[PDB]
Write a structure and sequence with these properties.
A: 315 residues; mainly alpha; Serine Threonine Protein Phosphatase 5, Tetratricopeptide repeat; 14 helices; B: 482 residues; Glycosyltransferase; two-stranded antiparallel sheet; 19 helices; 3% strand; binds the ligand Cc1ccccc1CN(CCN(Cc1cncn1C)c1ccc(Br)cc1)S(=O)(=O)c1cn(C)cn1; binds ligand FII; binds (2R)-3-(cyclohexylamino)-2-hydroxypropane-1-sulfonic acid; binds zinc ion; transferase/transferase inhibitor; prenyltransferase; protein farnesyltransferase
C-alpha cells in the first residue's frame, strides 16, 4: 500500500500546504491520493523555497504523474542548477522518460534548457538522439522545432562544422526518401538549403535545388509539400516561373515528367495554379483568369470562392 | 450566398491519389478518408428537405453538448491540472456559443475560482496561485473567462482585474525577451501562442506600452514560413542580424500569429508593425481545407489530417488574413474565401459525438469528444455560419464616440522612457486600440446556416474568440467607456 508522506521520517519536519482554489471550485479534478499528497508537500517545499535532494526527488515524482506540470518542471530546473547536479545524468533521465512514454511542451523544453546550460563543444550526440526519436514519430512538431533550435543555437556559437551540416542534409534526404509527403522534413530541408545564415547560394546551388524539387514533383505529382516548396523557392529567390513551365505543363492537361506514373489523375490543381501565376508573370491576365475559373468551377471546387477571388483579381 | 461554397454532398468524393508511391502519410490519409466518408454516407444531407429515411440526422445536438459540458472531472484529467483556466474557458465559451446561460451563483463560482489562480505579483497560473506560477496562456484563458462569466459589481471579478493591471503588466515585462519574443512563464518556452495570449490581454486591459511591444512585430513576422502559414517561433541570429522560422506552418501558430499581427496594426508606433505576407497567409489558410472525401474540415499543416479544432485555428484566421489582404490591396490602389458550407457539414456530420451518447464534439470520427474540441469546433462553426468583417466605418464610429478623458491609471513602465512620449500620444493609442478591438461586425445578409436555423449558434469575435456581447462591455469597463 501507499505510505503517506506525513508518515515518512524524511519528511517529518514539513507541514503540507493544501491546495487553495477556495470553496466550491469549478472544474475540480479528482486526484489520486499519491498526486494530492505529493502536491501538498510540493506546495510546502516551494513556499519555503527549499533547494534539496528531497525536493528534487519530489519534483520527479510529480512530473511522472503529470508531465505537463510546468510549475514543477520550472522548480526542477532551479533545483538542478542550485544543487549543481549533473546535467548529463538529467539528460539520461529524460531519455529514460522517453522509454516510459512521458512527453510534452515541458519535457522537450527541459531538454533545451539542459543543452543550453551544458553548452557542449559538440552537440552531435543530441542531434543523433533527436534523429532516433523522430524515426517512430516522424512529424512530431516540437521535436522538429527543437532540432531547428539546436542547430541555430549551436551554429551561432560556431559549433556546427561543415561535415555536420553535410550529414544533416544526408539525413534529411533519407527522411524524404522514406516518406516524400513528410512536410516536416521539407521544412527542415528549407532551413538546411535556404534559410539558415550559413547556407550557400550560387547559380549551381539554385540549379541543384531546382533539380531536387522537380524530381520530387515528378515522383509524386499530387504531393502538396513539393509544390509549396517549389513555389516558396521561386518566390524567395525572385526566379521567373516561365522558364520552368515545360516541366509543369504536362500536369495541367531540367527534369521532365515520366508516361506519367499510375494513379495520377489530371489536371493537378497546383499545376494549374502554377500555370495561372505564370500567365500573370507574362501580363496575360485573361488567360490567368480562365485558369482560375476552371480551378473554381471544375478542378478544385472546395476552394471555388478563393479561385473566384483570384479570377476577379485579374478581370 | 452559396454559389461558391458547394456542399460536400454535391461534389465527387475521390481519395488523395497515390501516384503509385505508397508512404506512411498516404496510409493514414486513406484510412482517415474512409472513416469520414463512411460517416457522411450514413448521414442525411443537412441541406436536403426530404430528410432521408434510415439515415442519421445531422442537426446540432445542443442539449447533448450542454450536458457534456455540465459534467467534477475524473482522474484522467490530471494531465490538464495545469490548464484549469482552459477547462473553464472551453466550457463557458461553448455555453455562450450554444446560447445557454449560467445562473448568477454558478457565474460567481467561476469568478471566485479564477481569482484564486491570480498571483499578487502578476498573472494567472493553470491553477491556484499557492500551487502554480503565472503563465501567459492561462492568463488569456482566465481573462476571457472573466469576460464571459464576470461583471462590474464587487463580486464580479472585473474590479480585481482592474486592480491587477500593473502587476499583470510587470509579469508581461518579465516575460519579454529583447528579440520581441516572450517566455510563456518563468523559465518557459518562447512562442507565438504566448505573444497572442499576452497581446489579447494587454489590449483588453489597457496596458499596452511601447517598451512592451518593441520587436514583437519582428518576432511574429519572422515566424512566417515559405508555405505562407506561421511557425511557433523565429530564431534571432546575433537587435539580430537575421531571424529564421523554426518549424512548419501550423494552424495553431498561424492563428496566433495572424491575430497577434492584427492586434499590432492598431498600435500607432512609427513603421510598425513590420509587414507579413498576407496573400501567402490567405493562400496557406484556404489550402488547408480538406477535400469532399474528408468532409471539408481543416487540417493543421500540409500532408497531415483534418481535425475539427482547426475549424477555429485555421477557419477563424480566414477573416483576419482576408482583412490584411484587403488592406494591402487598398494601399496599392464578393465570394466567401473558404467553403463555409462544407466546414459546417464537417462540424454537424463528422465532429459531433454520435447521437444519444455523451455529447461533445471531437477531432474526427474515432476520437473521444473533449472540452477543447467542443469549444474549437463550435468557435469555427460560428465563423462559418456568420460572415465576419473588420469594418473601417465601424472603427470610425468608435473613434467618434471614444472619451479620452475617461480611463484607469496609466501603467508605470519598467524603464523610465518605456511609456508613451506624452498624454496626447497615449490617448491616441488608447483610442486606436479600443476602437479597432471593437471593429468586427457580422455582415447583414452574410449568414449561412447549413441545415436550418435550429443549427445557428452565436457569433464569436475573430482574434479574441469571445462573443461580441461579452467583448464590448468588458473592454468598455477597462477603458471606462461603458
Ligand atoms: C491550449 C492547450 C491547453 C491545455 C493543454 C494543451 C493545449 C494545447 N495542446 C492541445 C493538445 N490536445 C491534443 C489535440 C488537439 N487536437 C489534436 N490533438 C492531438 C488536447 C486535446 C484535448 C484536450 Br481536453 C486538450 C488538449 S497542443 O499545444 O496542441 C499540444 C501540446 N503537445 C505536447 C501536443 N499537443
Ligand atoms: C494557446 C494557443 C492559442 C495554442 C495554439 C493552439 C494549437 C492548435 C497549437 C498547436 C500546437 C502544436 C503544433 C502541437 C503539435 O502536436 N499536435 C499535433 O501534432 C496535431 P497535428 O497532427 O494536427 O499537427
Ligand atoms: O441535443 S438534442 O439532440 O437536440 C436533445 C436530445 O436529443 C433529447 N431528446 C429528447 C428525447 C426524449 C423525448 C424528447 C426529446
Ligand atoms: O506573492 S506572489 O509571488 O504573487 C504569489 C505566491 O508567491 C505564490 N507562490 C507559489 C508558491 C508555490 C509554487 C507556485 C508559486
Ligand atoms: O427555421 S428554418 O430553418 O426554416 C427550419 C427549422 O430551423 C428546422 N429545424 C428542425 C425542426 C424539427 C426538428 C429538427 C430541427
Ligand atoms: Zn484537434
Amino acid at each position: 500500500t501507499y505510505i503517506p508522506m506525513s508518515q515518512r521520517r524524511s519528511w517529518a519536519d514539513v507541514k503540507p500546504i493544501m491546495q487553495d482554489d477556495g470553496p466550491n471550485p469549478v472544474v475540480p479534478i479528482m486526484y489520486s491520493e499519491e498526486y494530492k499528497d505529493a502536491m501538498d508537500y510540493f506546495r510546502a517545499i516551494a513556499a519555503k523555497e527549499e533547494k534539496s535532494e528531497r525536493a528534487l526527488e519530489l519534483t520527479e515524482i510529480i512530473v511522472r504523474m503529470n508531465p505537463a506540470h510546468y510549475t514543477v518542471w520550472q522548480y526542477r530546473f532551479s533545483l538542478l542548477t542550485s544543487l549543481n547536479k549533473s546535467l548529463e545524468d538529467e539528460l539520461r533521465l529524460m531519455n529514460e522518460f522517453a522509454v516510459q512514454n512521458l512527453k510534452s511542451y515541458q519535457v522537450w523544453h527541459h531538454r533545451l534548457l539542459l543543452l543550453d546550460r551544458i553548452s557542449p563543444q559538440d552537440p552531435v550526440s543530441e542531434i543523433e538522439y533527436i534523429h532516433g526519436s523522430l524515426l517512430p514519430d516522424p512529424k512530431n512538431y516540437h521535436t522538429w522545432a527543437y532540432l531547428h533550435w539546436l542547430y541555430s543555437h549551436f551554429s551561432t556559437l560556431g559549433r556546427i562544422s561543415e561535415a555536420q551540416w553535410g550529414s544533416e542534409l544526408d539525413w534529411c534526404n533519407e527522411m524524404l526518401r522514406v516518406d516524400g509527403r513528410n512536410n516536416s522534413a521539407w521544412g527542415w530541408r528549407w532551413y538546411l538549403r535556404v534559410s539558415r545564415p550559413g547556407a550557400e547560394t550560387s547559380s549551381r546551388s539554385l540549379q541543384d535545388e531546382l533539380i531536387y524539387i522537380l524530381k520530387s514533383i515528378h515522383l509524386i505529382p499530387h504531393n502538396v509539400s513539393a509544390w509549396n516548396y517549389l513555389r516558396g523557392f521561386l518566390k524567395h529567390f525572385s526566379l521567373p516561373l516561365v522558364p520552368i513551365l515545360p516541366a509543369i505543363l504536362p500536369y495541367t492537361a531540367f527534369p521532365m515528367p515520366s508516361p506519367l506514373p499510375e494513379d495520377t489523375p489530371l489536371p493537378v490543381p497546383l499545376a494549374l495554379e502554377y500555370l495561372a501565376d505564370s500567365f500573370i508573370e507574362q501580363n496575360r491576365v485573361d488567360d490567368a483568369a480562365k485558369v482560375f475559373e476552371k480551378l473554381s468551377s471544375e478542378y478544385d471546387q472546395m476552394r471555388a470562392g478563393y479561385w473566384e477571388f483570384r479570377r476577379r483579381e485579374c478581370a | 450566398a452559396t454559389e461558391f461554397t458547394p456542399s460536400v454532398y454535391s461534389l465527387v468524393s475521390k481519395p488523395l491519389p497515390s501516384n503509385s508511391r505508397p508512404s506512411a502519410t498516404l496510409d493514414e490519409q486513406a484510412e482517415t478518408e474512409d472513416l469520414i466518408s463512411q460517416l457522411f454516407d450514413l448521414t442525411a444531407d443537412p441541406n436536403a428537405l426530404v430528410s432521408e429515411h434510415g439515415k442519421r440526422y445531422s442537426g446540432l445536438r445542443k442539449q447533448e453538448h450542454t450536458q457534456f459540458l455540465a459534467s467534477q472531472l475524473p482522474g484522467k484529467f490530471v494531465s490538464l491540472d495545469a490548464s484549469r483556466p482552459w477547462l473553464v474557458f472551453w466550457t463557458v465559451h461553448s455555453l455562450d456559443l450554444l446560447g445557454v446561460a449560467l445562473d448568477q451563483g454558478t457565474k460567481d463560482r467561476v469568478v471566485s475560482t479564477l481569482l484564486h489562480f491570480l498571483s499578487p505579483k502578476g498573472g494567472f497560473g493553470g491553477g491556484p496561485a499557492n500551487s502554480q506560477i503565472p503563465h501567459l496562456l492561462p492568463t488569456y484563458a482566465s481573462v476571457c473567462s472573466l469576460a464571459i462569466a464576470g461583471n462590474d459589481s464587487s463580486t464580479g471579478g472585473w474590479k480585481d482585474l482592474a486592480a491587477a493591471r500593473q502587476s499583470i503588466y510587470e509579469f508581461f515585462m518579465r516575460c519579454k525577451r529583447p528579440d520581441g519574443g516572450f517566455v510563456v512563464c518563468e523559465g518557459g518556452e518562447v512562442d507565438v501562442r504566448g505573444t497572442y495570449c499576452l497581446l489579447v490581454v494587454a489590449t483588453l486591459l489597457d496596458i499596452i506600452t511601447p517598451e512592451l511591444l518593441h520587436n514583437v512585430d519582428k518576432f511574429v513576422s519572422a515566424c512566417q514560413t515559405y508555405e505562407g502559414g506561421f511557425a511557433c517561433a523565429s530564431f534571432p541570429f546575433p537587435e539580430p542580424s537575421c531571424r529564421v522560422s523554426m518549424a512548419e506552418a501550423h494552424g495553431g501558430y498561424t492563428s496566433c500569429s495572424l491575430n497577434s499581427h492584427f492586434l499590432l496594426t492598431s498600435v500607432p508606433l512609427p513603421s510598425f508593425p513590420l509587414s507579413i505576407d498576407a496573400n501567402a497567409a490567405l493562400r496557406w489558410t484556404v489550402l488547408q481545407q480538406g477535400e469532399p472525401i474528408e468532409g471539408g474540415g481543416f487540417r493543421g499543416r500540409t500532408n497531415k489530417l483534418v481535425d475539427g479544432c482547426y475549424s477555429w485555428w485555421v477557419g477563424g484566421g480566414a477573416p483576419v488574413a482576408e482583412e490584411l489582404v484587403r488592406r494591402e490591396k487598398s494601399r496599392k490602389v464578393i465570394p466567401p474565401i473558404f467553403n463555409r458550407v462544407a466546414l459546417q457539414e464537417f462540424t454537424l456530420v463528422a465532429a459531433q459525438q454520435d447521437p444519444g451518447s455523451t455529447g461533445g464534439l471531437r477531432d474526427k470520427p474515432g476520437k473521444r469528444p473533449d472540452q477543447y474540441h467542443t469549444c474549437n469546433n463550435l468557435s469555427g462553426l460560428s465563423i462559418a455560419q456568420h460572415k465576419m468583417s473588420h469594418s473601417p466605418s465601424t472603427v470610425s464610429s468608435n473613434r467618434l464616440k471614444f472619451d479620452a478623458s475617461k480611463g484607469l491609471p496609466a501603467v508605470k513602465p519598467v524603464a523610465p522612457g518605456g511609456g508613451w512620449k506624452n498624454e496626447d500620444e497615449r490617448q491616441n493609442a488608447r483610442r486606436e486600440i479600443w476602437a479597432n478591438a471593437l471593429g468586427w461586425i457580422e455582415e447583414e445578409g452574410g449568414e449561412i446556416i447549413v441545415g436550418g436555423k435550429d443549427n445557428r449558434i452565436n457569433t464569436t469575435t475573430p482574434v479574441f474568440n469571445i462573443l461580441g456581447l461579452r467583448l464590448k462591455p468588458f473592454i468598455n469597463y477597462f477603458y471606462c467607456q461603458e
